[PDB]
Every structure is written in C-alpha cells, then in structure tokens.
Amino acid sequence: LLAFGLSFYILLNLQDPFSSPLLSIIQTFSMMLGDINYRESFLEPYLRNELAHPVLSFAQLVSFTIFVPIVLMNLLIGLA
Amino acid sequence: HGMTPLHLAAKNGHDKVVQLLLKKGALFLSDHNGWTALHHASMGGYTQTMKVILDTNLKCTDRLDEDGNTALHFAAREGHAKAVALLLSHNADIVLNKQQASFLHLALHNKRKEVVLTIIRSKRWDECLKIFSHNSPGNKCPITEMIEYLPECMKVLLDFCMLHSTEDKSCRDYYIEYNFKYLQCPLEFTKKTPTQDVIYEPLTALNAMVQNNRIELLNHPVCKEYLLMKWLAYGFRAHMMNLGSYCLGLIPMTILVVNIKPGMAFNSTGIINLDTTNSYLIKTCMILVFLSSIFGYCKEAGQIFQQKRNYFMDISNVLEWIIYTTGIIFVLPLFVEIPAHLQWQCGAIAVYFYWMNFLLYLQRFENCGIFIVMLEVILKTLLRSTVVFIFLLLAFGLSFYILLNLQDPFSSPLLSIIQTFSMMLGDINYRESFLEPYLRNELAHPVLSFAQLVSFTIFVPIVLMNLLIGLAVGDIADVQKHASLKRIAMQVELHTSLEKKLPLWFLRKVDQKSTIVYPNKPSLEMEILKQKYRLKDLTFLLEKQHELIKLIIQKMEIISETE
Amino acid sequence: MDISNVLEWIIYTTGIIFVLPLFVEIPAHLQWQCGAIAVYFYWMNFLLYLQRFENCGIFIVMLEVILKTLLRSTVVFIFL
Amino acid sequence: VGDIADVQKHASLKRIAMQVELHTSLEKKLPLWFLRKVDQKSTIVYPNKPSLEMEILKQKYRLKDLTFLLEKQHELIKLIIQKMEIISETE
Numbered sequence: 098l099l100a101f102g103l104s105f106y107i108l109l110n111l112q113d114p115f116s117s118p119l120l121s122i123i124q125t126f127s128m129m130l131g132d133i134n135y136r137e138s139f140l141e142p143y144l145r146n147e148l149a150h151p152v153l154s155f156a157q158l159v160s161f162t163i164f165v166p167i168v169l170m171n172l173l174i175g176l177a
Numbered sequence: 178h179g180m181t182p183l184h185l186a187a188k189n190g191h192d193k194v195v196q197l198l199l200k201k202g203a204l205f206l207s208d209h210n211g212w213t214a215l216h217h218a219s220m221g222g223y224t225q226t227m228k229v230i231l232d233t234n235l236k237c238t239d240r241l242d243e244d245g246n247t248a249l250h251f252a253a254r255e256g257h258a259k260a261v262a263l264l265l266s267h268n269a270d271i272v273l274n275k276q277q278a279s280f281l282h283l284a285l286h287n288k289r290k291e292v293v294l295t296i297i298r299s300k301r302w303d304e305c306l307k308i309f310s311h312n313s314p315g316n317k318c319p320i321t322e323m324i325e326y327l328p329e330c331m332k333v334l335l336d337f338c339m340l341h342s343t344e345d346k347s348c349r350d351y352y353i354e355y356n357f358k359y360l361q362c363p364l365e366f367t368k369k370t371p372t373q374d375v376i377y378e379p380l381t382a383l384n385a386m387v388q389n390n391r392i393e394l395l396n397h398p399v400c401k402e403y404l405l406m407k408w409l410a411y412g413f414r415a416h417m418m419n420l421g422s423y424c425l426g427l428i429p430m431t432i433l434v435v436n437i438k439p440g441m442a443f444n445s446t447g448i449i450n451l452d453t454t455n456s457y458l459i460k461t462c463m464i465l466v467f468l469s470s471i472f473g474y475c476k477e478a479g480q481i482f483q484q485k486r487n488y489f490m491d492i493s494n495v496l497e498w499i500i501y502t503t504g505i506i507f508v509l510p511l512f513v514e515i516p517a518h519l520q521w522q523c524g525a526i527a528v529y530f531y532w533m534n535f536l537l538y539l540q541r542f543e544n545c546g547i548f549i550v551m552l553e554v555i556l557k558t559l560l561r562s563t564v565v566f567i568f569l570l571l572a573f574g575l576s577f578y579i580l581l582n583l584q585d586p587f588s589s590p591l592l593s594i595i596q597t598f599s600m601m602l603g604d605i606n607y608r609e610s611f612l613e614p615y616l617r618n619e620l621a622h623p624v625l626s627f628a629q630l631v632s633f634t635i636f637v638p639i640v641l642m643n644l645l646i647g648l649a650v651g652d653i654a655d656v657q658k659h660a661s662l663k664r665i666a667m668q669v670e671l672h673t674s675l676e677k678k679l680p681l682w683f684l685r686k687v688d689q690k691s692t693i694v695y696p697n698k699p700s701l702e703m704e705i706l707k708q709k710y711r712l713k714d715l716t717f718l719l720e721k722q723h724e725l726i727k728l729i730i731q732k733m734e735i736i737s738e739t740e
Numbered sequence: 741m742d743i744s745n746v747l748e749w750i751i752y753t754t755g756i757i758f759v760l761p762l763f764v765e766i767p768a769h770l771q772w773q774c775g776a777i778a779v780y781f782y783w784m785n786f787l788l789y790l791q792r793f794e795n796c797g798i799f800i801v802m803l804e805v806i807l808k809t810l811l812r813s814t815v816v817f818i819f820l
Numbered sequence: 821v822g823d824i825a826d827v828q829k830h831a832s833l834k835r836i837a838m839q840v841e842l843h844t845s846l847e848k849k850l851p852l853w854f855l856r857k858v859d860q861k862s863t864i865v866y867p868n869k870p871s872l873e874m875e876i877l878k879q880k881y882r883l884k885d886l887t888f889l890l891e892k893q894h895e896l897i898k899l900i901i902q903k904m905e906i907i908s909e910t911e
C-alpha cells in the first residue's frame with residue numbers, strides 16, 4: 098500500500114480520492130478487494146485530458162490489478 | 178577356498194574349538210581374498226570368538242584383505258556393535274580400503290545405527306573422525322554422511338556438544354555451553370588457495386542438513402545456537418548495512434514525496450511553483466537520495482565484479498537499475514534544472530519501485546519472509562499463463578470494441594482491452610454499458626452484446642479467476658509443506674553467501690566456535706525402510722538356517738527308520 | 741464427436757461474410773455482426789492451438805476441466 | 821480447487837503424454853517414405869562443443885517366499901524327528 102498508494106498520489110493527484118498521501122493509502126486499501134473504479138478515476142480523466150501521466154497511470158493500474166486484487170488476495174485465500 | 182580350520186571355526190563362531198586350535202598352533206594364515214580368522218569372526222559378530230583370538234598374539238588384529246579392509250571394516254559393515262566395541266577397546270588401527278572408506282564409512286553406508294553409536298560413545302572418536310580422505314566422490318567427510326544417511330545418530334552427536342557442566346537447574350550460576358566443533362571446517366578450506374586444495378563451502382554441516390532435508394537436525398538447540406552465533410557475528414551486521422544503505426534513499430524519497438505537491442518542480446532552495454519554506458528538509462532529502470543512488474551504483478557495480486554473467490540472470494537487479502537512475506532524475510535539480518513534468522514522472526517510478534524492492538529486502542527474514550516466497554511463486558505462475566490472458570483479452574476486447582463501439586469506454590482498441598482488463602475482477606458495469614444503452618436503442622447489435630456479456634461473465638470473472646484461485650491454493654500448499662525448512666535454509670544460504678565473500682582474517686576475528694548460555698541469569702516411509710532391512714536380514718538368516726537343517730538330514734544316523 | 745470442430749466451422753464462414761465485399765456487397769450491419777463473431781472466435785480457438793505446447797499447455801487443460809464441470813452444473817444455475 | 825489439484829497431480833506426465841500423442845497421431849497419417857527420410861534413430865549430442873506402495877509390494881513378495889521357505893523348512897525338521905536314533909530317551 099505504500100508502493101501503490103504513494104505512486105497513485107503522484108499520478109492521480111488532481112482527483113479528490115488522491116489528494117493527501119493519507120487519503121491515497123486508504124483508497125488503495127479500498128481498491129484492494131477489486132473495487133478499482135477505473136471509469137471515474139482512470140478512463141474519464143484520460144478522455145478529458147486530465148491525466149498528467151497517462152501512460153504511467155494505466156501501467157500502474159494494470160500492475161495494481163495484477164498484484165493486489167489478483168495475486169495478493171489469492172495469497173490470502175490459499176493461506177486460509 | 179584356502180580356509181584353514183582356524184578360519185572355519187571362527188567363521189561359524191565356535192569359540193571353544195577356536196581356543197583349541199590356538200592351543201596347538203594355527204599361524205593365523207590368510208585364505209583366498211586374504212582373510213584371516215579375525216575377518217571371519219568379525220563378519221558374524223562372534224565377539225566371544227573374537228575375544229579368544231585377540232588374547233593370543235595381537236599380530237592378526239591389523240591384517241588386510243584383498244581390498245585392504247581390516248577386521249573393523251567387516252564388523253562395522255555387517256552391523257555388530259559389540260564387535261566394534263571389542264575391536265576398539267583393543268587398539269586396532271583405523272585405515273582406508275582400496276575405495277578410501279574407513280570403517281565409519283561402511284557403517285554409515287549400510288545404515289548400522291547401533292554401530293555408529295558405539296563409535297561415537299566410545300573413545301578414539303576424533304581419530305576416526307579425521308581418518309577420512311578427500312578427493313573421493315563417495316566416502317566424504319564422516320559428518321556429511323552422518324547427515325546424509327543416519328540423522329538420528331547425528332542428533333546423539335549434537336547432544337554431546339550441548340553440555341551443561343552443572344546440576345542446579347534454574348540457578349544463577351547455571352549455564353549451558355554449546356560447542357560447534359562438528360558443524361564447521363576450520364575455515365582455511367573455505368577459500369580457494371593454492372595450499373588449501375579442499376574447497377569445502379562454509380557451514381558444512383548445516384548446508385548438508387538443508388540438502389538432505391534434515392529438519393529435525395536443523396531445529397536442534399546446538400544448530401539454533403550456531404545460527405544465532407553466525408547472526409550476531411556478521412549476519413545481523415551485514416544485514417543492517419544493506420538495509421540501512423537502502424533506507425538512506427528510501428526514507429528521504431518518501432519525505433520528499435509527501436512534503437512537495439506532486440505537480441511543480443523544486444530546486445534545492447525549495448519549491449518553485451517560490452515557497453522556500455522548510456527548505457533545509459527538502460535540501461537534505463534531495464542530497465541523501467542522490468548519494469544513496471550513487472552508493473547503489475557502486476553496490477551494483479561491485480555486484481557485477483563479483484558475479485560476472487550470472488548477475489544478468491537475475492530479475493531483481495534490473496529493478497535496482499530502474500531505482501537508482503530514476504532516483505537521480507527526481508533530484509537532478511541539485512545541479513541542472515529539468516522540466517517539472519519529467520521530474521515527477523521519474524518520481525512516480527522511483528517511489529513506486531522503492532517500496533516494491535523493499536519487499537525483497539525482508540525476504541531475508543523469518544517472520545514475514547515466507548510470504549515473499551509465497552508472493553513470488555504465485556507471481557511466477559501468473560506470468561507463466563500470461564498468454565492465456567492476452568488471448569482472452571484480445572478475444573473479448575476486440576469484440577467489445579466492435580459491439581459497444583459508440584460508448585466512450587470502448588472507442589479505440591487499446592481502450593477496449595484495458596476496460597476488458599478492468600472488467601476481469603467482476604466490475605462489469607452492465608447498467609451504464611449494457612442495459613441503459615439497450616433501453617435507449619443505442620446498442621448496434623443488442624442480441625450479440627448480451628451474448629458477449631454472458632460469455633464474458635462466465636469465462637473471465639468466474640472461470641478464469643477461479644483458475645487463478647485454485648492455482649494459488651496449490652502453490653501455497655506445497656510452499657507451506659516445506660515452510661519450516663525454507664526459512665532455515667534461507668538463513669543458511671544467507672550466511673553461506675556472506676562469508677564466502679568475507680575476508681578470512683575477519684572471519685577469524687568474529688567466529689567464536691563455542692558459546693555459553695546462561696538460562697536463568699539474565700515419519701512413515703522411514704518406518705517401512707527400517708522394516709524392509711529388518712526383513713532382508715531375516716530371510717538371509719532363514720536361508721542360512723535352511724542349509725543347516727539340510728546338513729542335519731545329510732549327516733544323521735538312521736537305523737530304525739530305514740523302511 | 742468433437743466440439744472443437746464446430747468452433748472452426750463458425751470461424752471460417754463468419755470469416756468469409758466479414759470479407760464478402762471482395763465480390764458481392766452486403767449491409768454494413770451484417771458485415772460487422774459476422775466480424776464480431778469471427779474475431780471473438782479466432783482468439784478463442786487460438787487458445788486451443790497452444791494446448792499442443794508444454795510451458796503454457798497445462799493451463800488449457802486446467803481451463804477445460806473447470807469449464808467441463810461448470811457445464812455439468814449448468815441446470816443448477818438455470819434453476820437458481 | 822479440487823479440479824486443479826488432480827490435474828497438477830498428473831501434470832508432469834500430462835505434458836509428456838500430450839507430446840507423445842501428438843507425434844503418434846502425426847506419423848500415423850504421414851507417408852512411410854517420408855518417415856524413412858526424416859527418422860535417424862541415433863543422435864550424437866556434443867555437450868561442450870557449441871514410491872511407497874511399490875515398497876509394500878516388494879515387501880509382500882519378500883515375505884511370500886519367506887513363508888514358502890519356512891514351510892519347506894518345516895517338513896525337513898518333521899523328517900528329522902521321523903528318522904532319528906532314539907535309544908537313551910525312550911522313556
């Protein structure tokens with residue numbers, strides 16, 4: 098959550114879910130279950146040219162979705 | 178076969194008639210294969226026959242057969258513990274055969290548990306420990322076969338190292354001294370030297386333990402104290418400079434991120450936007466990240482000097498190379514100004530990859546390091562099935578690009594795949610994407626779009642995601658099956674790789690080889706293989722018994738029953 | 741008695757109807773309707789052609805056995 | 821989870837059996853003259869120039885002949901008492 102939360106704080110800084118570092122981590126903790134919004138946070142900012150780093154934001158989106166809801170949550174299932 | 182009557186009497190172990198032949202004179206000749214009577218009496222374990230033989234002249238106790246085995250070799254190979262105790266009470270010499278095996282090697286290869294306990298518990302144990310020879314593929318160092326073949330007798334050997342030298346339990350003067358004389362070479366054979374032809378890699382007994390899966394030996398209190406000695410000697414110190422030099426750039430990066438707004442650039446004098454508030458904190462974190470990055474260059478350039486062409490077969494090294502350049506470009510306004518867009522672009526890469534790589538630095542722990550091994554094995558089998566993800570996202574993404582083309586989530590092909598990748602977890606919208614377009618007659622192909630929706634929902638969030646779950650359950654299961662051995666083997670491989678590159682004079686200084694601890698002052702297949710050997714000699718005895726009974730009928734008085 | 745052969749028969753006709761304006765014109769609605777079927781089923785069937793490999797072919801066997809036991813319980817889904 | 825477990829239990833054999841069944845079905849339809857051309861039947865490789873139930877069944881057979889030997893041994897000892905000189909111990 099410090100890796101993804103601080104990177105999302107830099108990339109998606111203009112959006113209200115990622116405004117302080119301590120709101121970026123809670124939102125990244127909320128996206129842990131698979132509740133990545135991607136439309137109000139990634140797609141519609143990108144189509145309005147509101148993403149500062151567009152190619153990094155989608156790369157961080159894909160690497161988040163692979164790691165935390167897929168890989169990390171399947172690790173907790175297989176542990177349980 | 179050249180056997181004299183002294184050989185035949187001692188082979189079947191008749192001590193009274195073997196006393197009679199020596200009362201007349203038998204000269205202790207050697208038959209074909211060169212065995213004397215003591216070779217026959219030992220192979221059979223007739224200690225009472227061996228006793229009367231060994232009280233005549235002692236000229237026969239050190240003879241050699243055609244392979245050079247002495248009498249102790251035969252008594253230890255066939256597993257006669259009272260025979261080797263008798264043959265060691267008398268000072269019979271310990272030698273090697275033509276295959277460079279001592280009598281300890283033959284007992285370890287034939288798994289004679291009661292014999293090697295009598296070797297350990299008796300005297301002359303050190304002199305048969307050092308009697309082995311190097312440059313031999315079989316019959317190595319006697320400790321290493323004791324790990325390899327008879328781990329329960331190694332546990333008895335480790336009990337002799339754990340001494341108390343007291344009897345007042347839970348006393349202030351009570352102590353337990355642990356000795357590590359059997360766990361290690363004297364470290365001159367660890368480094369490559371022209372005078373030291375032996376190349377024994379360090380922590381020899383523990384590296385043999387993790388290779389031969391001896392988890393019960395690794396949890397021994399001598400081996401736990403031995404690792405804790407190696408930890409406090411150099412293991413904790415070398416881990417603290419490695420983690421400490423990394424946190425010298427990790428922590429000033431995070432301070433620099435959360436204290437500057439991620440839009441605009443910043444000099445060392447402060448934020449440009451010009452703020453110049455708390456500019457001392459921004460300057461030193463800019464300086465500390467720059468010096469820790471160029472320390473990481475010399476750390477990586479020192480790694481390619483020690484590891485040539487096997488450095489590049491490691492994926493963690495390319496993570497460090499991203500980390501140290503993008504650290505510098507984040508703080509390049511120390512010297513030369515750069516655009517604010519480039520500075521924070523490299524800042525987002527650096528602060529993301531710092532904490533991802535700091536996850537790798539706690540793999541060298543025990544309480545949380547097993548989850549990084551679980552994280553790596555799940556990630557490895559997800560990248561092994563990545564082409565199935567590519568072809569599923571190309572199937573569904575390009576079809577959704579055709580069907581739902583009028584909607585902004587599916588406008589380019591490269592935004593259709595990312596949205597299909599986002600719908601993978603079960604975040605199919607279906608209302609703003611499928612239902613409300615259908616009720617507004619905005620779906621071009623309505624019946625295909627709902628058919629693609631149902632076939633997507635079956636395949637990717639249900640079937641494909643349950644495949645990754647069931648892959649991860651099996652992958653965690655065999656990691657947790659070997660988890661207790663994995664954390665100890667990671668600690669052993671840490672210290673083995675550490676003192677392989679440490680200088681020898683430093684290793685002489687920090688090693689202490691015996692620690693004193695004051696306590697109160699401050700499982701089934703092995704049972705079958707034991708039973709198979711207990712049956713293999715049983716049928717060997719019965720066949721030997723059967724020829725005796727065949728001999729009885731062959732030589733028997735029959736007058737009354739002659740038909 | 742093979743289900744993969746009917747996937748190929750969908751693939752080759754709908755390929756032709758996608759590119760039938762080589763010879764005879766067709767409505768645009770029909771052309772892209774068969775285009776969506778063809779490009780979906782091409783990559784689904786290309787998943788079957790890597791079953792004859794070793795490094796990734798075991799996941800197609802895992803995908804087939806999970807899919808077979810989901811279609812064996814399909815009536816429980818219908819009634820629920 | 822159960823369906824992946826018994827696939828991974830036979831996974832190492834499955835990939836080899838898929839390769840064998842590939843080549844078996846391939847050269848079943850290939851012509852024989854072509855198979856004579858491409859087969860070479862001996863390859864030279866230059867290396868440096870460029871588990872428990874079987875133990876029980878082994879032990880059962882090692883016990884089945886042991887009781888066969890003991891029964892053969894028992895009739896010999898029965899023969900010894902059958903043909904033996906007894907004068908001093910005739911009650």
Ligand SMILES: *[C]C(=O)[N][C]C1=[C][C]=C2[C]C3=C([C])[C]=C([C])N3[B](F)(F)N12
Nearest residue numbers: 306307318319320321361362363366381
């Ligand atoms: C056996 C093992 O492993 N370790 C031990 C060893 C090795 C090598 C060696 C050598 C020697 C000498 C010369 C002396 C002695 C005592 N040693 B040892 F330590 F046994 N080693």
Ligand SMILES: [Ca+2]
Nearest residue numbers: 480493494497
């Ligand atoms: Ca490295």
Ligand SMILES: [Ca+2]
Nearest residue numbers: 742744745748
């Ligand atoms: Ca076919």
